[PDB]
């Protein structure tokens, strides 16, 4: 049973899955848009949305909280100076997932794009 349980497992143990979210978060904030599998993309939304929101708050505490996940002061600077002001008046919903039409050849996996919002 899984009754009212939140959060995918993605066939990874607890530290692999966490490192998976951090590395996707680093990649999406680096490039603005990435392709993954649909289930990975859907989980990345909330993980990134929380980090963008903290950058919107912009204080030193919020920068240190984000650096636990993102580690790269350069990237965090970009998130605070360039990315976060884009969303000052947007209350959540900083990311979007759109499904792609063609599966990956080698395992048939449904793919999706994840991107930051305008």
């Amino acid at each position: 049973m899984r009754h009212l349980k939140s959060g995918r497992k993605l066939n990874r143990h607890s530290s692999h899955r966490l490192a998976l979210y951090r590395n996707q978060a680093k990649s999406l904030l680096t490039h603005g848009r990435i392709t993954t599998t649909v289930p990975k993309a859907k989980e990345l939304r909330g993980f990134v949305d929380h980090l963008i929101h903290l950058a919107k708050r912009g204080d030193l505490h919020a920068r240190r909280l984000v650096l636990r996940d993102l580690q790269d002061v350069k990237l965090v600077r970009k998130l605070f100076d360039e990315i976060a002001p884009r969303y000052r008046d947007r209350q959540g919903g900083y990311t979007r997932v759109l499904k792609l039409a063609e599966r990956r050849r080698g395992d048939g996996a449904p793919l999706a794009l994840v991107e930051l919002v305008e």
Partner: protein, 59 residues
Amino acid sequence: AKHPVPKKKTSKARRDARRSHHALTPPTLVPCPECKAMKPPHTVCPECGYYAGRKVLEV
């Protein structure tokens, strides 16, 4: 355990009856409103890159 084993060869009739559930369903495709190419619903059009009215992707 003690290694269970087919007692009889399955007949052609019985083999094929088991496969009565094996036909594929053809893919569900809708026409893309922009370029009219057929594509899976709820996916970014792979032919012109449009979805929800706007360009999204480079093809």
